[PDB]
Design a protein around this ligand. Sequence first.
Ligand SMILES: *[C@H](S)C(=O)c1ccc(Br)cc1
Ligand SMILES: *[C@H](S)C(=O)c1ccc(Br)cc1
Lengths: 302, 302
Amino acid sequence: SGFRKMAFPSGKVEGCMVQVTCGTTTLNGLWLDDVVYCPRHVICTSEDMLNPNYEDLLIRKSNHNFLVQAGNVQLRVIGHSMQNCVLKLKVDTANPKTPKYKFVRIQPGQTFSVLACYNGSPSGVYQCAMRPNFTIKGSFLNGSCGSVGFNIDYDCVSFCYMHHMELPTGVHAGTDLEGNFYGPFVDRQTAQAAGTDTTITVNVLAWLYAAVINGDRWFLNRFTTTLNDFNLVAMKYNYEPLTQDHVDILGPLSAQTGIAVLDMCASLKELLQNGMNGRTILGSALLEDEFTPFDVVRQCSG
Amino acid sequence: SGFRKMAFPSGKVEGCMVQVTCGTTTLNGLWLDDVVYCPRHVICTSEDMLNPNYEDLLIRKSNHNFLVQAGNVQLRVIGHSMQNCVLKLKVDTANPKTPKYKFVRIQPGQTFSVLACYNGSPSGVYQCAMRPNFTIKGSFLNGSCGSVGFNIDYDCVSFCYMHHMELPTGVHAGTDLEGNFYGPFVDRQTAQAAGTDTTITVNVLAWLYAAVINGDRWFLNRFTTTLNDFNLVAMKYNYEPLTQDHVDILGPLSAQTGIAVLDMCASLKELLQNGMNGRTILGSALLEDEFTPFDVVRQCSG
Ligand SMILES: *[C@H](S)C(=O)c1ccc(Br)cc1
Ligand SMILES: *[C@H](S)C(=O)c1ccc(Br)cc1
């Protein structure tokens, strides 16, 4: 019993974290086989923030301009290239700790674990979700760029995020591991800001099922709703539309609790319209939307 | 920016997790140097739950009754002994992955990271706090006993918890790594239950400072209070008393924000008396008490 914001064990990723220095700029890199991945912003200088031309900046560098440190061991850089917003530094040594891995791009509403790192040294691990507006509500300080987000399935690490920058509302933006940004952001200094965000409905419903599995039942009711009527209410409260695929994905949790998805939707409608009247659900006083149906099934009793 | 419930990176502990089997009972163990630590309940059988005499149960076992598996490698048990509620299995091989480590017992109100494990395999990592009533609000399923809680300082893992059981309210009880329970619980089947709990005041204040460091300021006010008047209100709301040592420990955060501790106390008093009127703090709609002053300083900008 119990329900926590749980991350994947971070050991497989810890063994891949390195420090990358170019000029007076230091940040984190990810060492897999004989390649180190890092943000290309590492080749900028203090004056280059406004309109860097990265192709120009990179053609003026050579391998010896990149210092890579894995713990207390300097890795010799033997090639360098750029792919979208990331840099690929070929080193003369394959990381002996490389896990089985994949580079996957995730969808808004999906969750992942972040290993926050400074100077190539892991500092903490936490769970995040990709918001509908393609930002993440991370916890990052200066020097954390290059930190990665991931999921682990069996023995395989699916890397899905590399951290780049912080937007003016304190939320975070980054790329997949092919260097393509999530959302309409760029690695340069502009007035860019997070766009409007919405709540991830299917996740809220998953979390209500978690609560029922864990014995919070006070928000249940004898009502049902149609998907259309539910989605009318959802729209009114800035919630994403619920699709039939979402209903299908909630099938297992529905079956385990014996609560039809559209019955749980009726509960959510009442909670949106009435609040919780001073009660809590799984120790929260607001509706939590950063657990996927998969997260609930993995953590909760069967 | 940002503030998350952050755990320590778990890799150093992952390399210590093993599976311990006795009869038809399997659970997790912790392998450090040439010793494996696990709950002594592993030597119980289905009939022994009510009033086990562990001394008797153990004298009837020998080394070959204990199967220890580290990944795909069977560790040969060469001695066995009991220390309070844990078992110590001497194995013929020192764990090559043993980190620098300590066995520390923690105080109510202190936090630690939990590596939830099943069958000796790590499954997730999350942050917890020891409640004033010596329970923890964990996330544990059947088979998780033997999972450990820890903090990491520099390179040194301070183990502080081994998981044993779940109480009837769904909260969890366990021991330190010398096998002594936290709180008035025992490793046998009784009507034992969590006693009354209280909110950890100094932690709530630490978290309000986190929020100010992160730009939530709406709950601040121009008032101050005395420690005595504050503690009168605290008592009324089931909050722990605030001591001068607590005020001193909050000194750094006070200095960084320029908000005197007793001014922040005045804010907390108003929040207890009035609620938040539909606002949130660091994405919560209730007052969070599972971050210590140290946790805030470590995670937050300086
Ligand atoms: C450092 S966290 C980094 O990579 C970076 C990327 C993009 C911008 Br804009 C600033 C800093
Ligand atoms: C398994 S999680 C275990 O160690 C245990 C300890 C004490 C009691 Br009572 C039940 C199970």
